[PDB]
Design an enzyme around this catalytic site. Structure first.
Site, PDB file in Angstrom:
ATOM      1  N   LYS A   1       1.114  -1.268  -0.332  1.00 19.45           N
ATOM      2  CA  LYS A   1       0.034  -0.076   0.196  1.00 19.45           C
ATOM      3  C   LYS A   1       1.257   1.181  -0.153  1.00 19.45           C
ATOM      4  O   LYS A   1       1.470   1.410   0.948  1.00 19.45           O
ATOM      5  CB  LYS A   1      -1.100  -0.280   1.319  1.00 19.45           C
ATOM      6  CG  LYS A   1      -1.832   0.663   1.545  1.00 19.45           C
ATOM      7  CD  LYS A   1      -2.786  -0.294  -0.288  1.00 19.45           C
ATOM      8  CE  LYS A   1      -2.779  -2.114   0.562  1.00 19.45           C
ATOM      9  NZ  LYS A   1      -4.361  -2.556  -1.015  1.00 19.45           N
TER      10      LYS A   1
ATOM     11  N   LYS B   1       2.895  -9.553  -1.397  1.00 20.82           N
ATOM     12  CA  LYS B   1       2.744  -9.287  -1.747  1.00 20.82           C
ATOM     13  C   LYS B   1       2.941  -7.925  -3.461  1.00 20.82           C
ATOM     14  O   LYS B   1       2.167  -7.246  -3.062  1.00 20.82           O
ATOM     15  CB  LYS B   1       1.646 -10.464  -2.986  1.00 20.82           C
ATOM     16  CG  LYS B   1       0.063  -8.838  -2.111  1.00 20.82           C
ATOM     17  CD  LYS B   1      -1.087  -9.849  -3.256  1.00 20.82           C
ATOM     18  CE  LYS B   1      -1.541  -9.982  -4.473  1.00 20.82           C
ATOM     19  NZ  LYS B   1      -1.519  -8.420  -5.140  1.00 20.82           N
TER      20      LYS B   1
HETATM   21 MG   LIG Z   1      -5.295 -11.684  -5.230  1.00 18.78          MG
END
Ligand SMILES: [Mg+2]
Ligand SMILES: [Cl-]
Ligand SMILES: [Mg+2]
Ligand SMILES: [Mg+2]
Lengths: 448, 138, 448, 448, 138, 138
Positions: free
Chosen positions: C158, C184
Site C-alpha cells: 500500500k 505481494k
Molecule cells: Mg489476490
C-alpha cells in the site's frame, strides 16, 4: 506370514485405475499357493521384515500390492496363476523403466517361491493414456508409403556383415528395385572396423532414391542407429533424417530409456522407427521364468516403436499359432478381450494408442504365402532372407517372385477364394505368368 | 517401366471380372469407393484427380464398374485407380488402392542430384511426362 | 432440426472417459428446451448445415457431442440445465486452450438459444491424469515454509503504485517482520515509468531476507512476473529464481498458454506460483452468460497454479457461503461429490493432482476471524489490505494484530471451543495480551 | 465516500496522453450514479480503505483514476455511462496483460455497483505507438497474395475433426483449387489421438502447392499452431515456416501474452497470423456485464494479429449492422470518429498501426453476396462452411460458385450498379455463365 | 527476539492445560504425535532432534504430556516442539507443529551479504548461538 | 487451364464496355492507372513489364482504352493487366488489378518436388512456357 500382512486379499475389488499383473508361480515344494501369491505381492510392493513405525507416517495400505486371486494352472498341478493388483499412484507416468522396476524387480520370496514368470499385464486406461504410443503407427505409415491392403515386404542384406559401403548399397538397390518395400541393416551392423556407419548411410540413400526412380514407389531401408550412448544414437538418427530416410531401426538391447528417447525423436521428426527384437535368443523357450513376450508387446507399443518382430507361425519359427495370434492382437487392436488360449488373461482398452506393425521373419518362403496371409493378416511386414538374395536369377528376381506371390494371394483372399486350401494352386497360377516365381516355387519343393 | 503403386501392380492388369470381385470385397468391408486419375505419377503425388465423389453404401458392383469404364473412356491415357476408404474408428483411411488403367507406355523418372554439404546429395525425381503440359502427356 | 441430427440423445450412457459439461441454457422465446440442448451440443461438436459426404470418411458419431439430459432450473421456468457429453478423443492431452476452445467456443445456436452459461464440468480421470496439476501444492508449500495447521497471512503493498524501489521494500520489510507470512505485488505492478521491475525485485529480496533474520521464519513476497511476451515473463521469473525468492505471481490476464508455461517452469524450478484473478471484475455477477468461477478453479488446478483467489464469504465480498464452499472443495479435495447447493453438478475424482491454496481477499478484517476460520478452513491465505498498512501504530503493528487474532482463533478451534458463537470474546481475550490487537478491535467497531 | 476521496471530478481536463475508459454502469439499487462512477474509478486505481501514510511518499494524485463524466444511458433509466481517465504512467508500454489487469480488474464496488460492462476505450496516441500493431496488415497481406480490390474467400475444413492427414489434405486441395483463397483448420483441431499435428501440416502443404500449380495463384491454409505451452506453439509455428506456409492461426483462448509472443514471431518471420475468436460463445449476448467486442478489436489490433472474426450482419449471425460497422472501422481505419450509433464513444488516432482484416463467418451463403459486399466492404475474408463442401457437385464446384458470385458482385459495384437493390438479378446474370453458381442459387431458395 | 516458527508463537507460551487440549485435538484427528528439540533455530533446519519415536494410536494426553516434561527437564535450554503427523492419503505430512519450550533468551540471527554479480547479493542467516558448540548454547 | 490472378478472372474475359466502366471506377477513386504485361505467369512474378508509365490525374477512359488496345496489338500472346494504384496515406499500393488479355492457350505449371529432411519437400512451380525463350512462348 505373507497372507497375514494383508498382501493376500481374496476379497479385493479391482479398480479401473489399478495396474494388474498375472504371474505363473511355482511354489517352493510344500508351500501354500496362497502364501506364494502373497510373497510375490508382498515384495514387489514393500521390502520390510520387522517393527517399522515409519509406515504409519504414510497411507500405508495404498502402497501394498494385493494378491487377489489364485487359480491352478490347467495341466500343471504345481504351477499357479497369481493375479496381483497395484495402485496407479505407485507408477511414474509415461515411464517404462519405472513400470518394469516396480513389477518384475522386487518380486522376491525365495522361501515360498521356486519359479516365477510374468504372463500378462492389465495396464489401466488412465496409465496408458500417459504414454505416447507408436511414433507413426500402422495407418500413418501406410499413408506415408501410399501402400494399402497388403502386407509389406522386406529382407535383411546378405551377408549381414562385410560388404563395403558401395557393395552394400548394390544389394539394397537390387532388392528394392526388384519389388521389396524395405531392405534392412542387420541388428549387428552398427559401426565397425570393416565398415563405418556414415558411408553406409550415404550409399544406402543413393540406392533407395535410385530404386524409387526405377519403380515409382516410396522405398525405404532401415538404417540402424543403435549405438553405445544416447549422443551417438542421435548423431546417427540425425544423418538419417538429414538425407531423407523414411525409416530407421534400433535394437531392443539399447534398453527401455533409449527406446522411449528414440520414440519421442521419431514422433518429432516424422520417422518410422523399427524395433529389432531377436525372435530366438537365449531368453526364448521358457515356460518357467522371466516374462512372456506379450508383456514386451504391451510395453513397446506404449513406448512408441512402429514395428516389432512378433513371430511367425510356420517356417523355422515353430510357435503355437493361437499364442502368436495373441501377440498380433496386442500390437494391432484398439481393445483386447480376455482369451485364455491366446494367453490374454485381461480385457484391456488401448486408449486410442496407435498400432504397431508386426514383423514376421524366419525361414519363411514364397511357397508358404497362403499360410502367412491366413495366420498373420494384412498388417504385417513379411521378411525373407536367402529367399530373395539367393534366387538363382539374382536379387531382383528373388524380390519379384515374393512380391508376385504376395499380391496373387491377397487377390485370392479378396475374391473369397478358399485360399488356405487352394494356396498351392493359386501360386502355381501366378507363377504361370512369372518365371521368377516359377523358379522360386521349384527351388522350394525339395523342402516339401 | 511399370509403375508399381497399387495393391496389385505386380500382377497383370485386372480384367473386368477381377475388378468386379474387388468391388465385392470392398462392399463386404463396407468401404466408400472412389475413382481417381492422374498423369503425374510421382509417388508423393498424394492427390490424384477425383472422378466424381466416392460412392457410399453401395450394394451392387455395376454402377462402380460403369464409372470406371466411363473414366477410362474420358481419360484413356491417364493412370486410374480405385480406392476403398474405411470409416472404422482407429483406421479412418484408405485400406485398398489399385490400378485399373495405365498409359500405353511409361517412360518413367529423371533423377536429379543436387550436391550439398560434404558428400550429401539432395534428391528429386521428376516424371518425364511432367516435363510437358498435361494435355500432351502419354 | 438438431434433435433430429443425433445431437439429442435421452438414452446416451455416460462413459468414465467422457468429458461432461453442464450449461445453464435460456431457450430463445418459443423454442423447445430439448431443441436448445441439442443446438449447444450440435455446434460445440460440428459446424455443418448441408449434404457433407466427407463425414462418411470418418467415424462421424465419435465426434458428435451428445446432449443427454435436460432439467428445468429450479425457481426459473425458462432456464434449463443441459448436460453435454464429449468423447475424450476430441481433446488434446494436457491442453487448457484446446479444452476451452472445444467447449465454450462453438456452442452457437442463435436461433434456439438466447442465453448460455457454463456451470460445471466433469473432467474424466484419464484426462485429468494428462495434466501436471499444481507446481507445488498445499502440502509441499507448507513443508517449504515450515508452516502448519493455520491459514497463511498476506497483504498487498500500500499504495499499489508509486513507491520507489527502496520505499517499496520498506513496506515489505515492515509487514513481513510484524507477522505476515507473505506480502505481494499488486496485479497492476509489472514494470512502468514510475518503477521498473529489476530494482523492485532487488530491494524486495533485501526486505525479505531482513525479515527472515528478524523473525526466524521463512518469509516471501510475491514478485509479479506478468509481462507482455513469454520471453519477458521468463527473464522476470529467472531473476526471482536467481535471487532466491520462495514465490512469484502471475495475472490470469496473461492467458491459459502462458499460465501452463509458467506452471511447468514453477514445477521445474521449485517456485510457488500464485495466480491473481480479480475477485470483482466486469465479468462477475452474471447469473446469465459466460462461465461460473468453479470451472476456472478446475482448469487452473489442472494447469498447475499453487494459489488462486477463491472468494471470501464475509466482508466487502458478499457471496453465498455455500457456493463459495464449493469453490474451496474444487481447489482442495481429492474427490468432489455432486451437491446442488454448492453448485457441484458432477462427482469427480481429482486423480491425485495436488491441491491449490484458496486466497481470501476483500474488505476482510481481524474482528471477523471467527467467521473466516469457520467458513474458509485452515488451508487458505487470508489477505488484509489497509487492515495492516493503516494500523494507527504502524505496519508492523497492523501485521501483529492480524497474526495474533489468527492464532488465538485456531487455538480456540482446536480446543473445541464454540468459536463461531464465542468469536468476539475469544478475540477480546487475545487482545488483553496484545495492544496492537486491542487497537485494531476498537478501530473496527464503528463498522459494527 | 468515493466522490469525497477525489475519484469523482466533474472538472477534470482530459489530456492527450490519458487512457480513457467508458463503462456501462448499473448502480446497486438506491446508490447515486455519481457515487457508482467514483467507485469503479476508485478501485481500478487503488485498493485502500483507512489512514495510509505511505501514499504521502508518492505523487499520490497521479495514480488515482478520475471519473470525470456521467451520462444516463438513453432508453435505460438505471444504467449510466461513466467515463474514467487513467494517467499514461500507470501502464507498462507494449503490454496487453498490463492494460487489461489495470482496467477490467480492480473495478470493484460491490456496494455501489450492481452491474458493469466496459464499452469502449480511448487509447492515447503515445501509448498505441508503443505497440507493434499487425504483424503483416491488410496492405502487405494483399501484396504478398497479389490479390486486390475484392474480399478474400475461405472456409473451414468439413468435418472439423476425424479426417486422416491424407483425407484432410484432399479437402484442402479440392477447395483451394476450386477457387477459395484460403482454407483453414478448425479452432478445435490442434493435435489429438485421431490425428497429430505434423502429418496434417505435411499433407496440407502438398495440397496447397498442388492448388497453386493448378491455378497460378498464391494459396494458403491456416495451420493452427494453438497449443498448451509457448514451446509447443513455437515448434508448430516453426514447421509452418519451414514448409513455406503463407499463413498460420492461433485461438484467442491461448491468451494475451501468447498472442503478443506470436505476433512478434509472425512479424519476424513473414507469416500472416489469423486470430480465431468464437463469434457466438457463452460470453456473447450480454448487454449487462463483461466487455464489448470493440474493446477486443482495439487490443488485438494493438497486439498485432492480421485477421480477426468481426461479425457478419446477415445470415445466422443476427447483429445490429451499425454496431458491426463500428467493429470494422476499429480494425481498418487510420482514425476513429466518435459515433454513438456505432458504439464508438471516443475519437481515436491509430498512430499508423497497420490494419487488421475482418473475417465474416456464419450461416452466410452465395445468394447473400450483395448484402455482404454492401455491409462489409472489400477488406474482409468471407468464410463459407457447408456452403462449399456440400455443393451437390463437389467441393471444387462449391468454391467456384462462391468465387464467381463474389467477383460478379464487385464488378457490379465498381460499375456503380445499384447492387443492393439489383443483387439477385446480378447473381442470376452471373449464374447464366456458371452452372455451379446456378446450382448453388437454387439450392438456397428454400431458405427464401 | 521471539522466534515465531510454530502454529502459536504469536500467543504467549502455552500452559500445560492448553498443551493438553492441543494433544486432545491431535488425538481426535488421529495423528502421530512427536516431540522434537533443537538449539540451531535456523528456519531451514528441517530436522530437529527426535525425543523418542512419535507416539501412535494414542488415546490419552497424559503420556504425551509426561514426555514433554521429561524433554523439558533434559533439554531446558533448547527449543522443543510438538508435531502432529497425518497419514491421510494426499496429506501424509505434518499438520500442526507448535513450540512448548524456548530458551530463556534468544539473541537471534546474523545476516551475511556476499556481493555477487552486478547488484545481486547472496544471503545467509546464521543463528548467533550456532557460532558456539551445542553444549555452550543458551 | 485458366490463370486466376486478377480481380475478375472467375468471370468471362471483359468486353471493352466493361473495361471502360472499370476505368471509370478507377478514375472516380483517383488512382494512377497502369498497364503491365508478361509471359512468365508465375504467381510470385511480382514485376510484369510496364507498357508505358502509369497515367495520372486521368479524367476520360478513352486514352487508357487506346493504350490497352495498342498493348494488345503489340503483345497479343502475353498476359496483360490493368492496375490501379492508390496514394491515399496508409494504403499507398495497388487496390485493383485485372486481366484484359490472355494467350490463346494456357498449358499451366510443372510442380517440382525436391525431397529434403525426413518427409519434408521443397516445392517449385515452373510455368511450362518458361521452359522456352520469351519470343517462343504462347
Ligand atoms: Mg489476490
Ligand atoms: Cl536447397
Ligand atoms: Mg527383425
Ligand atoms: Mg473464424
Amino acid at each position: 506370514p505373507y497372507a497375514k500382512m494383508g498382501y493376500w486379499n481374496p476379497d479385493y475389488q479391482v479398480k479401473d485405475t489399478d495396474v494388474l499383473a498375472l504371474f505363473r508361480v511355482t511354489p517352493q515344494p510344500g508351500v501354500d499357493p496362497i502364501e506364494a501369491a502373497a510373497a510375490v505381492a508382498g515384495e514387489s510392493s514393500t521390502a520390510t521384515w520387522t517393527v517399522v513405525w515409519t509406515d504409519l507416517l504414510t497411507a500405508a495400505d495404498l502402497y501394498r500390492a494385493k494378491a487377489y486371486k489364485v487359480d491352478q494352472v490347467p495341466n500343471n498341478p504345481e504351477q499357479y496363476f497369481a493375479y496381483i493388483a497395484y495402485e496407479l499412484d505407485l507408477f511414474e507416468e509415461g515411464s517404462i523403466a519405472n513400470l518394469t522396476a516396480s513389477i518384475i524387480g522386487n518380486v522376491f520370496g525365495f522361501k515360498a517361491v521356486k519359479a516365477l514368470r510374468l504372463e500378462d499385464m492389465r495396464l489401466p486406461f488412465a496409465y496408458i493414456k500417459t504414454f505416447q504410443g507408436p511414433a507413426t503407427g500402422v495407418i500413418l505409415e501406410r499413408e506415408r508409403l501410399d501402400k494399402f491392403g497388403r502386407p509389406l515386404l522386406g529382407c535383411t542384406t546378405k551377408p549381414k556383415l562385410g560388404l563395403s559401403g558401395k557393395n552394400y548399397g548394390r544389394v539394397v538397390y537390387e532388392a528394392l528395385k526388384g519389388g521389396l518395400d524395405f531392405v534392412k541393416d542387420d541388428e549387428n551392423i552398427n559401426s565397425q572396423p570393416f565398415m563405418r556407419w556414415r558411408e553406409r548411410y550415404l550409399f544406402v540413400m543413393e540406392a533407395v532414391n535410385k530404386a524409387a526412380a526405377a519403380t515409382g514407389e516410396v522405398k525405404g531401408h532401415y538404417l540402424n542407429v543403435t549405438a553405445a550412448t544416447m549422443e551417438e544414437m542421435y548423431a546417427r538418427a540425425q544423418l538419417a533424417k538429414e538425407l531423407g530416410s523414411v525409416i530407421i531401426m534400433i535394437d531392443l538391447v539399447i534398453g527401455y530409456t533409449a527406446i522411449q528417447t528414440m520414440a519421442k525423436w521419431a514422433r518429432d521428426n516424422d520417422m518410422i522407427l523399427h524395433l529389432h527384437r531377436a525372435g530366438n535368443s537365449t531368453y526364448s523357450r521358457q515356460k518357467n521364468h522371466g516374462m512372456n513376450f506379450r508383456v514386451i508387446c504391451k510395453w513397446m507399443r506404449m513406448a512408441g516403436v512402429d514395428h516389432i518382430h512378433a513371430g511367425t507361425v510356420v517356417g523355422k519359427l515353430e510357435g503355437d499359432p493361437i499364442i502368436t495370434r495373441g501377440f498380433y492382437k496386442t500390437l494391432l487392436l484398439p481393445k483386447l478381450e480376455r482369451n485364455l488360449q491366446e494367453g490374454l488373461f485381461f480385457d484391456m482398452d488401448w486408449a486410442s494408442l496407435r498400432k504397431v506393425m508386426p514383423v514376421a521373419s524366419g525361414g519363411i518362403h514364397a511357397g508358404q504365402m497362403h499360410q502367412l496371409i491366413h495366420y498373420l493378416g494384412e498388417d504385417v511386414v513379411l521378411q525373407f532372407g536367402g529367399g530373395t538374395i539367393g534366387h538363382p536369377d539374382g536379387i531382383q528376381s528373388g524380390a519379384t517372385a515374393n512380391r508376385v506371390a504376395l499380391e496373387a494371394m491377397i487377390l485370392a483372399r479378396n475374391e473369397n477364394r478358399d485360399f488356405l486350401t487352394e494356396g498351392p494352386e493359386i501360386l502355381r497360377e501366378a507363377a504361370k505368368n512369372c518365371g521368377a516365381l516359377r523358379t522360386a516355387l521349384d527351388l522350394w519343393k525339395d523342402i516339401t | 517401366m511399370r509403375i508399381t503403386q497399387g495393391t496389385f501392380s505386380f500382377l497383370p492388369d485386372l480384367t473386368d471380372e477381377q475388378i468386379k470381385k474387388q468391388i465385392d470385397y470392398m462392399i463386404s468391408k463396407k468401404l466408400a469407393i472412389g475413382i481417381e486419375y492422374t498423369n503425374d505419377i510421382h509417388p508423393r503425388n498424394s492427390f490424384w484427380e477425383m472422378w466424381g465423389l466416392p460412392l457410399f453404401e453401395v450394394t451392387d458392383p455395376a454402377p462402380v464398374l460403369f464409372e470406371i469404364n466411363a473414366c477410362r473412356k474420358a481419360k484413356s491415357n491417364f493412370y486410374i485407380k480405385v480406392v476403398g476408404f474405411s470409416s472404422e474408428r482407429g483406421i479412418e483411411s484408405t485400406i485398398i488402392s489399385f490400378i485399373v488403367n495405365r498409359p500405353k507406355h511409361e517412360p518413367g523418372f529423371n533423377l536429379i542430384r543436387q550436391e550439398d554439404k560434404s558428400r550429401s546429395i539432395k534428391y528429386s525425381i521428376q516424371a518425364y511426362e511432367t516435363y510437358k503440359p498435361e494435355d500432351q502427356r502419354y
